Amino acid sequence: MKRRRCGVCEVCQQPECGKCKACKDMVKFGGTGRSKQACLKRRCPNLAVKEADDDEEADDDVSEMPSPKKLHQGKKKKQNKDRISWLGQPMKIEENRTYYQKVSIDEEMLEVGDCVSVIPDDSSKPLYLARVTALWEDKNGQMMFHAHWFCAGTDTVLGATSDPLELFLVGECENMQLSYIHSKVKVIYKAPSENWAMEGGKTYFFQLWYNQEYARFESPPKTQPTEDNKHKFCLSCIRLAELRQKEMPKVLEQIEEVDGRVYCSSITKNGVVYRLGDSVYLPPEAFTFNIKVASPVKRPKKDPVNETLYPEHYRKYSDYIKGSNLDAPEPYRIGRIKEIHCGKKKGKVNEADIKLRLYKFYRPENTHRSYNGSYHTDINMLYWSDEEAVVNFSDVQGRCTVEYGEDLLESIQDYSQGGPDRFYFLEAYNSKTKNFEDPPNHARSPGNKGKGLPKLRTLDVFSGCGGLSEGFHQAGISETLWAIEMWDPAAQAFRLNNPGTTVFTEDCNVLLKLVMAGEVTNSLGQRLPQKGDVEMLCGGPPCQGFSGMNRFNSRTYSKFKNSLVVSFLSYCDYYRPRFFLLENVRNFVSYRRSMVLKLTLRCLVRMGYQCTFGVLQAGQYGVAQTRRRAIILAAAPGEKLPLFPEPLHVFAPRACQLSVVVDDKKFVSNITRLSSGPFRTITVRDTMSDLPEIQNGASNSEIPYNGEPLSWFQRQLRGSHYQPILRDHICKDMSPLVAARMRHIPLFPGSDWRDLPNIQVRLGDGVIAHKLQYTFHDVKNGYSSTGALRGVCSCAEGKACDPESRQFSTLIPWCLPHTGNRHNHWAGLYGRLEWDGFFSTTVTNPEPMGKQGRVLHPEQHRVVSVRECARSQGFPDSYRFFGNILDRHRQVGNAVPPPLAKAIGLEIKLCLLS
DNA sequence: TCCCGTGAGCCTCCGCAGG
DNA sequence: CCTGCGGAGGCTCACGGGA
Ligand SMILES: Nc1ncnc2c1ncn2[C@@H]1O[C@H](CSCC[C@H](N)C(=O)O)[C@@H](O)[C@H]1O
Ligand SMILES: [Zn+2]
Ligand SMILES: [Zn+2]
Ligand SMILES: [Zn+2]
Ligand SMILES: [Zn+2]
Structure with a gap:
């Protein structure tokens, strides 16, 4: 897989000179251009796969109502029936009504268990379809029946991608005068074959049950008639019954x-x-707490920042501090x-x-x-x-x-x-004497005086260094026996952490086409996974190929049919695991107007899997980082579809929009803890306060922990067994210019490039970083408090960009104020994390000037070390990575935070202990 | 009436061949 | 060294509806 150049670093930004053998041979410079190489001064050290895509908070307020009941819209066109006679003798007679089994309507015979169509008020709507669960005449001499509603594919998330002939049982049912019935339609129940697992390669039918509010497709319930309801058995009713008795x-x-x-x-x-x-x-x-709490004093008066020393400080219009737990519940x-x-x-x-x-x-x-x-x-x-x-x-x-x-x-x-x-x-505790005596005799349980499951063989595809597997392992439901990882450093790191598993360093596509063609081992004599071998199939397919929001077209949809996610499903289709987990970026759920999600679900249900989807925020599961991921769960017919985990930690409300809209329908997960939770949020302090101080470029891949754990989080990550060695506490060696900048960002929460001094600095390079000069007027941004210009290009005056206007080696990066207006003033760039806040999504390569560029240590003048990142995710310090400093960062940033993978893992455990 | 997001198609230069 | 070439990822610009 071919790598490439980043857009951010000081190397890339430098423009072309025309002095090179190559710069001289460039086509535009009149050269023949047979060379095909970039400027000598433009070889980016950070050169690596930017085969990644950040996710924006594209979802609105979602200040909208929960999905109303599908068939519960009343309004049903009543038909006119001439004759409606019972048939045979009554099944049962109750106090207030009399139940039959057969009834004839206009020469048409119906029976309990038959399926009937009904006509909706609205003409647009497709006919309602339902199962007759009882027949009876009432006191009022009215001839009634009970309908258990079906639900068309098109009414589910599946939307238009559904098979037209498919219906789904739903938890909805009402009573009705027989005369509302239009026709009787035949409906077959497509139950899973005896040899379902082994089959990899014009009538209404149904196979699954659909929970509208949660978008869950599950196997038809097994509940069985009682003495009292045999004559009138309806699943929808009982489901609701058991709900209420529980609620x-x-x-x-x-x-x-x-x-x-x-x-x-x-x-x-x-x-x-x-x-x-x-x-x-x-x-x-x-x-409340009966403890005297003194309301703090209103902050001092801050002396207006010197506009000439801090020109770009105005751009810090009062804004939500990125990575702040001032919103934490x-x-x-x-x-x-x-x-x-x-x-x-x-x-x-x-x-x-x-x-x-x-x-x-x-x-x-x-x-x-x-x-x-x-x-x-x-x-x-x-x-x-x-x-x-x-x-x-x-x-x-x-x-x-x-x-x-x-x-x-x-x-x-x-x-x-x-x-x-x-x-x-x-x-x-004594809120009065503010002292700390020990527990009264009634707090204890009176005692003696004194003072102190089979694992699923998992196949992990696009495993990376194995964040996911790590979390699963922690939960103790999996034993990863095979892993597929095309990228060689990641694959090695995986091997390093799992001696029991066979990592295939190949393209999942050929590996698949191998075992299908009846191959037993790859060219390296590694035993290939065979149907029956794989019990669980988990993966994280990259969607960078077609990460688009606009509608599918002719050849854009072709780019999909050949995607990696479609390979993942071909694996699911072939192996037929008991369980299936696809994890992706949060945006997975809205790419291509959510056709990606709709199409994968359609796939799973086609096979006959129970399945659901949801979005999770990692912070809520014990990690000081914002990280929303989409998650698909699937379960073999014979299984229980798992639920989503319940948040363990309180987390900033903005980082927690977990609801998702598909076709103007609102879906949520079973998650109940909306705001609060059992535990406090984990902080940057909690994450990495015990780490020794290091300088820019620190390459020492083994140093001692000079100190013990200072956090619950740290005691968890460092374990209890004695371990004096601290591995991978190393950060990138930033340009002398960039190092100088980092030195001049303040320490207070909210610091970033906008806080930089416009001064001249003699670097530890010999070269001198100059003042930036404002020589144009910025129509939108106006003047300084002293009438100084604020524009650095002709384009700030509305006119066309003058290329000669660009400025180099300046403490304040000329390019930032240059585009800041059309890009939100690049909030965060050259920004520092704060001890009480959290990491913005851990990144694969820390650039102060990348998009997710809030990556400077809270105090030290540098970017975050590989460990600090591993720590912002959920990696036990024991966990080993592999490669140059860049390889390692990428592995960490790519991986599912073990805490999250564990949380899910435990939810699956509950489905084996069923 | 525009504005936002393209995504087919030209632009770049990475990884490696082979002299 | 060097020369040079495939080929894939990036960046561009005209073009389409979403309202
Ligand atoms: N074609 C391909 N075949 C196998 N692996 C691939 C691949 N393309 C990308 N990958 C790998 O798939 C990974 C997806 S990131 C997922 C990481 C993993 N879930 C974890 O928790 O660690 C990346 O590490 C990437 O190197
Ligand atoms: Zn670069
Ligand atoms: Zn050059
Ligand atoms: Zn009912
Ligand atoms: Zn400009």
């Missing part, structure tokens, strides 16, 4: 009655069961349920009025110590208080576990790592 609060144990308030010991809601002494997740507003409040008591209504217990007497729990950042006092603490560690509060059981977000430190029968770390939602506390 609504009930109660399981009552202790006593008192003062018109029954006291309870055990209540349930939404599938979770709460008992006295259990702990609970609540919203931030559920209760607070995490769930936590408390221990002390008492439960419900009200009463109609002489009965009123389950809609359950309240909780709770012991407030302090998060370390909740004490007076504030954040500055919780930097080094376990994110799951709590401080007990005796401060109480009463809460409505309707506000409870979930159960969690909070255990006394010492009380635990294992290691604290063992405990935390043991399962989800596990907190612990060691001391207790």
Whole structure:
């Protein structure tokens, strides 16, 4: 695969001279041009594959309504039927109605189980189609039936790409006078073959069930008739029934009655069961803290920045600071349920009025110590208080576990790592004496005195260095036996981290065409994967080939049929894994007006897979980086389609638009934690504060950790086993000019190129970087506060660009103010990360002047080291990379953050323990 | 009436041949 | 060294609807 040049670096930007043997031989310079080489001074050191594409926040507010019910639009054209007679004897007689099985309508016979068409109010709409689930005459002498609605492909995400003859069962059903029926249409159920896995290479039919709100296609439910519903069995009804019984609060144990308030010991809601002494997740507003908090003082008056020293500082119009947790919500409040008591209504217990007497729990950042006092603490560690509060059981977000430190029968770390939602506390807090005594005898569970599953054979395609696999492995559901990675450094790094797996360094296409042609091994004698071998197929196909937003055309769609994603599906089609995971950039879901997404789903469903899609933000799963990825899940017919993970960390609301619009329809994932979460957001401080200080160019690929972990995050990434060596703490050697610039960016949050001094600097190069000169008037931007010009080209005056107007070796890059107006003032370029913020999407090659160019260390005068990047993703420091400093950066930036891959991994685990 | 996004087609120069 | 060539990725400009 052929590499190329970056557009950003100081090398590239330098224009052509005409002094070279090549510059002299160029066609434009009159040369024959047989040379075909660039300027000698324009050989970009950063030369590497820019076979990548950043993703913009293209989605709007999505301030729009959830999808209304499909067939639930009422308005159904009633027909006129002359004669409607029952047939045979009644199946069953109830108190209020009488059920039959057969009915004849205008000489036409129908039966329960038959499928009928119906006519919609609107003429445009395609006929409704449904299954008759019961027949009966009512008290009012009316002859009725119950319809279980189908749903046409075109009504789903699939849209027009659906097979016209395909319908999908849906959770919608209503009652109707038989006379609404138009015709009876035949509908076949295309169930999966006995040998489904092995088949790689004019009637209405259905195979799957469609959840509109979540865009999930799943295998028809297995629920079975009871004694009471045999004569009238409808899946849509039961589904809804079981939903409600789960959704609504009930109660399981009552202790006593008192003062018109029954006291309870055990209540349930939404599938979770709460008992006295259990702990609970609540919203931030559920209760305040009885701790005197002094409202901070209004910031001092800042002396107007010198416009002549900081010309381009005006361009910093008040703007949302990129990588700022000033928007971060607070995490769930936590408390221990002390008492439960419900009200009463109609002489009965009123389950809609359950309240909780709770012991407030302090998060370390909740004490007076504030954040500055919780930097080094376990994110799951709590401080007990005796401060109480009463809460409505309707506000409870979930159960969690909070255990006394010492009380635990294992290691604290063992405990935390043991399962989800596990907190612990060691001391207790006194909001009054602001002291830290230890837990009262009633917080503990009275005890003895003293003080302390088969794995899926996975085939990972476009594996890269194996971020994804790493996360899966962590979840313990996979054993990667084969990996395909066309790029040789990535492939090696993968081998380095997985001695058990066979990495094929080839184009997935030929590798596939090999095993299809009945080949057993590639030219290197590596055993090829055979049907039955692969249980899970995960991959990250690049879509750079056709990453377009406009509509498909003739030969643009051809570029697709030959894409890598289509190869991925040919793998899925051939191997027929139990599971299938495609991960991509967030934009995967809207490329080509979402034909990419629609077409892949269409493919999966064609094969007969259960499948869904969603967008996830990595920050929410334990990483100090903005990273939204699209995700497709698929599951063999016999399986359970997994769900999406539930956010673990609170994260900036702007970085979290997870909803997606396809054909003006709004889809979301099962994700419930919209804003808050169990844990605090991970910061740049949390990420890389323990790292030694390094200079620009630091190439030492082995240095010691001069210090211990200073973060929960770090203790997780460095493990507990003694390891004194710090690998890959190395950053790119930036031009002396660029190094000077980085030195002159302030340290405060919000710093970037716009904060640069317009001064003259003697570099450690001998060359001198000059002042930039403003010799044109900028009609849009006006004047300095002192009437100084702000334009650097004839184009700032509306006139045509003068090429001689360009300026070189200047501290403020001439090109920036030159285009800043039409590009948002390049917010972020030469920008520094901030200790309390987060990485903008980790990049494959750190350029202060690339598009995603906020990449300077918070304090040190340099770009971020390879480790700092590996750290902004989820890589354990143990994880090994391979190649020159550039190769490594690219591998890190390309990879799925293990924390995210793990989160998904665990969701899949739940489908094997089914 | 324009504006935004092209994407077919010309422009560039990377990786490697072979003298 | 050098000479030079394929071929693929980039950048351009005329052209199409989306409203
Ligand atoms: N034609 C091809 N065949 C095999 N691999 C390819 C390929 N084209 C690109 N790739 C590789 O596919 C990878 C996609 S980035 C995905 C990385 C991976 N999911 C992780 O978590 O680490 C890149 O590393 C790229 O080198
Ligand atoms: Zn460059
Ligand atoms: Zn030159
Ligand atoms: Zn029903
Ligand atoms: Zn200009």
